[PDB]
């Protein structure tokens, strides 16, 4: 488990908090991200 | 007339304190649903200052 998405529609129409922890780098953004139909991170 | 400054004119509910709404969804003010298209009882939520 490496992150979280918070919002209302999660489809680039509103602002959605995105938290990702990749290895040693915690990344926090509040952009209007365009998420995939089934968001995931590959290895 | 400077028309770059806008303000929200319609919203289904009042903002909570320190809430920021920048959505431009077409406001449905009548019983007929709006499909994202401006028109009768279907408002663009932002108005421009004079
Ligand atoms: C925050 O967003 C939610 C939806 O993501 C808003 O809930 C909507 O409230 C209106 C009434 O004002 C209902 O007609 C909608 O059906 C609700 N949406 C859902 C998905 O149930 C909520 O009002 C928003 N908060 C504020 C303060 O505007
Ligand atoms: C984690 O992702 C951010 C951008 O999302 C990137 O800048 C950073 O370098 C990444 N960290 C690693 C260890 O790859």
From Swiss-Prot, chain A:
Glycan-carrying positions = 22
Summarizing the annotation, the consequence of altering residue 38 to Y is: In strain: Gamma/P.1
Q: Which domain of life is it from?
A: Viruses
Effect of mutating residue 2 to I: In strain: A23.1
What does it do? Answer: Attaches the virion to the cell membrane by interacting with host receptor, initiating the infection. The major receptor is host ACE2. When S2/S2' has been cleaved, binding to the receptor triggers direct fusion at the cell membrane. When S2/S2' has not been cleaved, binding to the receptor results in internalization of the virus by endocytosis using host TFRC and GRM2 and leading to fusion of the virion membrane with the host endosomal membrane. Alternatively, may use NRP1/NRP2 and integrin as entry receptors.
Quaternary assembly: Binds to host ACE2. RBD also interacts with the N-linked glycan on 'Asn-90' of ACE2. Cleavage of S generates a polybasic C-terminal sequence on S1 that binds to host Neuropilin-1 (NRP1) and Neuropilin-2 (NRP2) receptors. Interacts with host integrin alpha-5/beta-1 (ITGA5:ITGB1) and with ACE2 in complex with integrin alpha-5/beta-1 (ITGA5:ITGB1). May interact via cytoplasmic c-terminus with M protein. May interact (via N-terminus) with host bilirubin and biliverdin, thereby preventing antibody binding to the SARS-CoV-2 spike NTD via an allosteric mechanism.
Query: What is the name of the protein in this document?
Result: Spike protein S1
Q: Which organism is it from?
A: Severe acute respiratory syndrome coronavirus 2
Mapped onto the parent protein, the portion here is 101 to 143 of 1273
């Amino acid at each position: 488990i490496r992150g979280w998405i918070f919002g209302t529609t999660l489809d680039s129409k509103t602002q959605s908090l995105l938290i990702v922890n990749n290895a040693t780098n915690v990344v926090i953004k509040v952009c209007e991200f365009q998420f995939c139909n089934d968001p995931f991170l590959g290895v | 007339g400077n028309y770059n400054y806008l303000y929200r004119l319609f919203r289904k509910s009042n903002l909570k304190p320190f809430e920021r709404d920048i959505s431009t969804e077409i406001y449905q003010a009548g019983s007929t649903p709006c499909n994202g298209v401006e028109g009768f009882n279907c408002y663009f939520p932002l108005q421009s200052y004079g």
